[PDB]
Ligand SMILES: *[C@@H](C(=O)O)[C@H](O)C(=O)N[C@@H](CC(C)C)C(=O)NCCCCNC(N)=[NH2+]
Ligand SMILES: [Ca+2]
């Protein structure tokens with residue numbers, strides 16, 4: 632279609648519109664080479680563009696929110712937790728996602744994203760062919776079936792690593808730095824200082840990204856609703872009145888978009904009845920299986936082992 636070895640998104644976009652053709656990326660083509668390098672995936676995939684998947688595809692629907700990041704059949708929770716964190720700071724999100732992009736205006740089958748690499752912003756261009764099975768995305772999707780920014784972001788990040796398979800292992804902090812240029816620090820929660828709630832509270836209010844995990848030694852599920860060896864996004868911290876004393880809470884989101892903690896302060900916990908109507912509104916309490924839930928600060932430090940904060944420079 633084109634010879635793209637050193638050409639910008641603008642150049643390629645304009646050329647495709649002139650030629651009246653959908654872009655096919657020579658550097659990261661829609662075939663098995665872009666999926667894996669060693670192990671194959673068990674199911675064989677068809678590559679389709681979002682217009683081929685649904686009638687009215689959209690890049691962004693109702694903003695870029697954490698609810699748009701739902702994990703599929705690829706173990707890249709480390710990266711997905713990081714994007715979800717990033718959506719809590721919209722200001723920073725728009726440096727990674729160019730928002731002037733669309734399926735309904737100047738569509739030429741080509742998109743781009745920006746990552747922070749070796750001390751500068753780097754532009755990554757992709758065709759919009761995505762892996763599918765039975766006409767559904769197999770990897771990351773949004774909970775809205777017509778929204779495609781998070782699927783395409785994953786493709787672009789996979790391209791930056793050489794393949795989808797190259798996203799299988801990783802650390803949330805690697806991704807946080809790729810989105811922000813911040814400096815990461817990690818904390819073992821067993822050596823957590825006495826004031827870590829306060830540290831966590833200051834970090835989210837500053838727009839620092841925060842992930843966490845439970846040490847391991849489709850990932851291991853626990854009866855309490857948590858998942859071991861799995862990256863969670865920390866999406867809020869608050870105190871709430873409950874039977875006289877103020878209880879400290881932590882809000883997490885499972886990047887699966889489902890499977891939540893079921894203990895104290897979970898969605899369907901009966902003793903939410905005892906909490907004031909205005910407080911429930913303040914904490915955006917919702918009984919919906921979206922992967923997001925509140926737990927007590929005490930239960931949090933008991934279960935979780937790693938805490939990762941990416942601070943802005
Ligand atoms: C998460 C998932 O989708 O279930 C996925 O299994 C994963 O990548 N888990 C991480 C642990 C999280 C950070 C909690 C993991 O196992 N990481 C090991 C990577 C070792 C370093 N490798 C590279 N390439 N830097
Ligand atoms: Ca959305």
Ligand SMILES: [Ca+2]
Pocket residue numbers: 891898917918919920921922923924
């Ligand atoms: Ca929930």
Ligand SMILES: [Cl-]
Pocket residue numbers: 688689690691732733734735
């Ligand atoms: Cl659109």
